[PDB]
Design a protein around this ligand. Structure first.
Ligand SMILES: Cc1cc2nc3c(=O)[nH]c(=O)nc-3n(C[C@H](O)[C@H](O)[C@H](O)COP(=O)(O)OP(=O)(O)OC[C@H]3O[C@@H](n4cnc5c(N)ncnc54)[C@H](O)[C@@H]3O)c2cc1C
Ligand SMILES: Cc1cc2nc3c(=O)[nH]c(=O)nc-3n(C[C@H](O)[C@H](O)[C@H](O)COP(=O)(O)OP(=O)(O)OC[C@H]3O[C@@H](n4cnc5c(N)ncnc54)[C@H](O)[C@@H]3O)c2cc1C
Lengths: 392, 392
């Protein structure tokens, strides 16, 4: 079989890239290691930037989002007995963020692809990339015991952190930057009304806590835990008690608790690889970089990578301007590094780090006091939170 | 579940390590991504060093090998109209090599493990390593939809070039050395009597050819092909004609051809990673390094890595000398680099390289003439071919 653009991974990155391209008349095939069900079981993201929202509208998959999504105009940070609200809309110049789960975005994209008739091969086992530096690269994979070959012009590696794409580039050609945090996030999804109409990020001595949501009757809560914890050691009962302990009393007493639909621990890390392409292979999303969930940038950076790749592929196919693809990494890395710096900053001021001396604790507290009390400080959080502008 | 040593991959490396350890009283669990059948379908190696042979005897899996294996005392190199034999036995000081297929070695090891009652989990999907730098590392995997956790003290990554082990070590902690050759080997396994009682490595203007065997009625032939070739473009008919064209007439006319049992193309590469361990994780075999098949060192280097790891694990468990494990990489890398240099040398003097000027062609030919005509030159090939001594 042959196609123009072969896409590895049917998560939001690949599906969004594949929708945009198909819409523009560029044939693409998506190869996914697992099943649609497995993909749909990942809870993950809840916060989307305006740029992600417009990209979904452009891809023609925004009906359900425009209806069910919640537009948020502010967020709250609670520390040292105080609760400070950041007016994102006012401080960022009218920009806002949208709360719509990643499961929903994925489901909408999967349905739009299903209907369009575009090719999608699930349970594509043992995917291997070949002739990346040639003019005719190809992908081999196993479907029901038989190994097929897919010929293409370009390959978009949208296979996540553990995908085959990044591994297929000669190690000596990549420079990795990584930071692993000494804690993870224990998340709990419940069918209960959220405790606030906006998100509450909390720095507490016992550790970080976050009050999020998915809709008016579905909440998502998180608490910072050491990497040595096991999810089975955390009953719903234990989670609620711990969460309550980390929140302001007035917030904790208004909390409607209930049994969990999902519970899991996500470890935290920062990771960037440079460059993000090799020959005819271009990395996008988690395949190229990871940001701690604190700044809500992962899925959103996946979106800007995809918007950039799509627009460069359009010029190549439509305008015969293939030389432009060489600019992929430079354009993306600029936005990636700034979003990494913000996610790193948020993570450092909101979490409890092991082995912290007196001076550092005081500086962490002072960072919050200064940034949340200065009009200029608030603006730096707001513009970064809503999302820095996409480069052209 | 808990065990002492968790082993990733049931190829010869993991099975051999697991047999040795079990025999010494150290419990180990082997996790394999595929099925026993898939493992048994890989043809691969045919030449074993004396050190590999003694290691199999020590592991108590040499009955069938001692019976069916063919001990070779010499090899032949054909170039420029000449056929020169290297008397390995005489030039290396009595050492020889043994021809016994890797499929057989694997089958013998699998049966010995089956009988011993030692744990082996096939179709162990989505294997992930955790807490490598801790005192209690663990492995998570999926077996029939359910994700299990395996606790252990040490983890031996014997999962090959594309395994999860090497990928689990922080990229910034490893320094990769790699060379990819512009050609691959098209191999053909036939149920016919070999053309010679010894192997024939041939440098011919059309490219490299190799006459090997598995037994008195089963041969293995190879011809050098560009990376752009597809196995389906090579009929048995086309292979035999090409092979015949690359061999000395007297050899080519004695050739008994026949339909193929197996046909495949293996690309050539040199690859070394330094160090070969991280915390409680130790890499072995193809997971740590790849050598072009020309010098017949891959499986053999896997054996010395395993012999070293086993002996260091024995001191740790039996003698409480865990500090010795830190020496793993230094000991192995010494043997690896020398076997890499030899495999690289063999590859460069026996193959046709694209874009070679007149001077280089003459030097390649002169290398053969000198090394095959000097008693000292012959000895350097012989001692390296039989295998350099294992370090203690
Ligand atoms: C707890 C948590 C909270 C988060 N919150 C936010 C938030 O509020 N906002 C935000 O922007 N980000 C957030 N993120 C991040 C976001 O979820 C990820 O960045 C996003 O899922 C990345 O999408 P991707 O398409 O790049 O890959 P992924 O979602 O990982 O999907 C990659 C796909 O490729 C497939 N694949 C892997 N290997 C292969 C192979 N060899 N062959 C074929 N297919 C393969 C995988 O099965 C998978 O389907 C959060 C993440 C977590 C963990
Ligand atoms: C054409 C050719 C000829 C050769 N000739 C010779 C010869 O004559 N002599 C010689 O010494 N060498 C030779 N070699 C090399 C030799 O075959 C390899 O070095 C040897 O197979 C390495 O063994 P290993 O156990 O390290 O791995 P492998 O044989 O690759 O096995 C690794 C195992 O790990 C499994 N695995 C992979 N990923 C995972 C995962 N995520 N989870 C669990 N399991 C996983 C794989 O399924 C596989 O079963 C030759 C190779 C080739 C290709």
């Amino acid at each position: 079989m042959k196609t123009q653009v072969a896409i590895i991974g049917a998560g939001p990155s690949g599906l969004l890239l594949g929708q945009l391209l198909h819409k523009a008349g560029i044939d693409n095939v998506i190869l996914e290691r697992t099943t649609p069900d497995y993909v749909l079981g990942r809870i993950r993201a809840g916060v989307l930037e305006q740029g992600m929202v417009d990209l979904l509208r452009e891809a023609g998959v925004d009906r359900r989002m425009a209806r069910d999504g919640l537009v948020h105009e502010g967020v709250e940070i609670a520390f040292a007995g105080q609760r400070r609200r950041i007016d994102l809309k006012r401080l960022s110049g009218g920009k806002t963020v949208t709360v719509y789960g990643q499961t929903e975005v994925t489901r909408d994209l999967m349905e739009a692809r299903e209907a369009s008739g575009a090719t999608t091969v699930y349970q594509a086992a043992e995917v291997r990339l070949h002739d990346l530096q040639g003019e005719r690269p190809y992908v081999t994979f196993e479907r029901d015991g038989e190994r097929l070959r897919l010929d293409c012009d370009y390959i978009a590696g949208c296979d996540g952190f553990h995908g085959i794409s990044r591994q297929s580039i000669p190690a000596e050609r990549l420079k990795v930057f990584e930071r692993v945090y000494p804690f993870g996030w224990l998340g709990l999804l419940a069918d209960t009304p959220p405790v606030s109409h906006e998100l509450i990020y909390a720095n507490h001595p016992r550790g970080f806590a976050l009050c999020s949501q998915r809709s008016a009757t579905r909440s998502r809560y998180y608490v910072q835990v050491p990497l040595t914890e096991k999810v089975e050691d955390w009953s719903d009962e234990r989670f609620w008690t711990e969460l309550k302990a980390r929140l302001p009393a007035e917030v904790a007493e208004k909390l409607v608790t209930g049994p969990s639909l999902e519970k899991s621990i996500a470890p935290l890390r920062s990771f960037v690889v440079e460059p993000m392409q090799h020959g005819r292979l271009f990395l996008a999303g988690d395949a190229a970089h990871i940001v701690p969930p604190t700044g809500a940038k992962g899925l959103n950076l996946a979106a800007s990578d995809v918007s950039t790749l799509y627009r460069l592929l359009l010029k190549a196919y439509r305008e015969g301007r293939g030389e432009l693809l060489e600019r992929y990494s430079a354009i993306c890395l600029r936005r990636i590094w700034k979003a990494e710096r913000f996610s790193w900053w948020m993570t450092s001021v909101l979490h409890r780090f092991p082995d912290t001396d007196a001076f550092s604790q005081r500086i962490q507290q002072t960072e919050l006091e200064y940034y949340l009390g200065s009009e200029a400080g608030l603006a730096t959080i707001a513009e970064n939170y809503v999302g820095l502008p996409y480069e052209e």
